[PDB]
Amino acid sequence: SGFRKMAFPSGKVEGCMVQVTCGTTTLNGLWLDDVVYCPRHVICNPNYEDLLIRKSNHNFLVQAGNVQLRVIGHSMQNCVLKLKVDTANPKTPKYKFVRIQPGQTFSVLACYNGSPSGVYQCAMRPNFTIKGSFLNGSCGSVGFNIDYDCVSFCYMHHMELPTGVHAGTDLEGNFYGPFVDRQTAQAAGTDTTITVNVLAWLYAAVINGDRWFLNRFTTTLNDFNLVAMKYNYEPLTQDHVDILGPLSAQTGIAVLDMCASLKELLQNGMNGRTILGSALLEDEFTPFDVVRQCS
Amino acid sequence: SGFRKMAFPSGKVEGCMVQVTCGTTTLNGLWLDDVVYCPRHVICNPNYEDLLIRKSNHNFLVQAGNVQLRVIGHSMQNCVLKLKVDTANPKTPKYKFVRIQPGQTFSVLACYNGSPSGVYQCAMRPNFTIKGSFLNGSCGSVGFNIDYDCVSFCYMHHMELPTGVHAGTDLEGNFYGPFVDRQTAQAAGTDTTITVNVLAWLYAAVINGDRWFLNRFTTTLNDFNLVAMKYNYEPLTQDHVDILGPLSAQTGIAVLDMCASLKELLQNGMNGRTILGSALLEDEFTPFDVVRQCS
Ligand SMILES: *C(=O)c1cccc2c(I)n[nH]c12
Ligand SMILES: *C(=O)c1cccc2c(I)n[nH]c12
Ligand SMILES: [Cl-]
Ligand SMILES: [Cl-]
DSSP: OOOOOOBOOOHHHHTTEEEEEETTEEEEEEEETTEEEEEGGGGOOOOHHHHHHTOOGGGOEEEETTEEEOEEEEEEETTEEEEEESSOOTTOOEEEEOOOOTTOEEEEEEEETTEEEEEEEEEOOTTSOBOOOOOTTOTTOEEEEEETTEEEEEEEEEEEOTTSOEEEEOTTSOBSSSOOSSOSSOOOOOOOBOHHHHHHHHHHHHHTTOOTTOOSOOOOHHHHHHHHHHTTBOOOOHHHHHHTHHHHHHHTOOHHHHHHHHHHHHHHOOTTOOBTTBSSOOOOOOHHHHHHHOO | OOOOOOBOOOHHHHTTEEEEEETTEEEEEEEETTEEEEEGGGGOOOOHHHHHHTOOGGGOEEEETTEEEOEEEEEEETTEEEEEESSOOTTOOEEEEOOOOTTOEEEEEEEETTEEEEEEEEEOOTTSOBOOOOOTTOTTOEEEEEETTEEEEEEEEEEEOTTSOEEEEOTTSOBSSSOOSSOSSOOOOOOOBOHHHHHHHHHHHHHTTOOTTOOSOOOOHHHHHHHHHHTTBOOOOHHHHHHTHHHHHHHTOOHHHHHHHHHHHHHHOOTTOOBTTBSSOOOOOOHHHHHHHOO
């Protein structure tokens, strides 16, 4: 019983975190086999190809705890620097670089000066920002999922935007969203609520005995989607209805009956009631998150 | 910027988690130096001294990943079993066994069959329960804080109570609260809201630019405490006012001015507004948690 924002155990990622310094700029890197990955900003209008051609291997200080790693090669891939080192990280887990979709969740290991500070779950918002928790020095901190023994790295932290939300890249240095790794007027676009996640979370609440918000009513996909649009919820698709199948089955509540409940919650609010300890409709749990945690 | 329920990085604890089996009962243990700690329930009205005297070392299967640990001694300390093993855990961190107070937070590493599944933050409620997330098999999962390099273990998971909340022990096997490790009519007592934490979190919101709920008003400790009692909030003490000092100073808001804001929030509710992404007054962040995460 119970329902928490649960992160993956961070051990496998902690053994990969290093400190990278160039000049008087320090930030975090990720040490997998004999490569260290970090934000190319570590070498800072800028023209990064110009800035990098002016560097040598000896201009990069990499520290894994105490041990200094010798840099023997450097190259840029999009917004990430790859520092080749003379030692394979003996703690390298099985890993993959995957890009996630808006609406998907991942764990963030927040790190300062190469030292892990804390782990929390995040969703990629529809507007390709994340509502993270990051202070000066967290640049290079990574986001990940773990399946069996395999770490799927999906995010590397770069920027804080003016609304206090966060912007970064996948591990091949491609930004999520229309953001750049320099100072501009850039701002988060308008965001939406992740409908499939809100329905997943209502399923979690049912599995955990919160049933107050249910009703005998139903609706069609199309009449649901007309109320969705009105309250800045993204459209529900048949794929979404299909991925909610296993939760529908476990609870005996049709997806379109759960939609009728959500329409009533959006039209009436909660009348001072809570669901799974929240007074608002939570949208940062995926169907997979609910199945992973509930039973 | 941002404010998340952040857990400690779990690596140091993951390297200590083992599986313990006795008969057909399996649960989790904690392997520190040459001792394994687990819930004595693993040997299950029961009379545990009777049950334990009937066991031998060979009746305990301890598995650290694949490696079977040889049990060379067994003893009971309150509700915890101590299995002496022939090998010191080479991954033992610096550690302490500390008992926490109601209102204090800790990280939970939820584990199944000796394998870590997920990490989340919990508070010890005033009624000495925790609102955890635990499924069958999580028995033995531990709660902890980390200071520098030192793991302070504070909780070992035992029971789910009929409201779906959780009960366990400190690492010397002394229960938090008036609970026993057997089936009875036992239930959580009435709970209260942790006032000092709610004020800490309002400070976090200010540090992060949520200031809508502030007012020009003040109150005394005693007039605050009269509204506290009415809404099932615990009393605020001068110690509490003292521990809020550093957050008061950083924000320039007197503790008793923040109390006046809280009284208004309790009397009026939020009028459909949010604070740090919540529509209700959050009480599971300590003053230390806010200082740790904010700046
Ligand atoms: C990390 O701190 C980081 C990464 C990319 C761009 C920037 C900027 I402008 N300031 N810090 C950055
Ligand atoms: C762990 O599962 C555990 C610990 C203590 C007591 C009990 C009981 I009764 N069922 N499971 C227990
Ligand atoms: Cl790999
Ligand atoms: Cl120690």
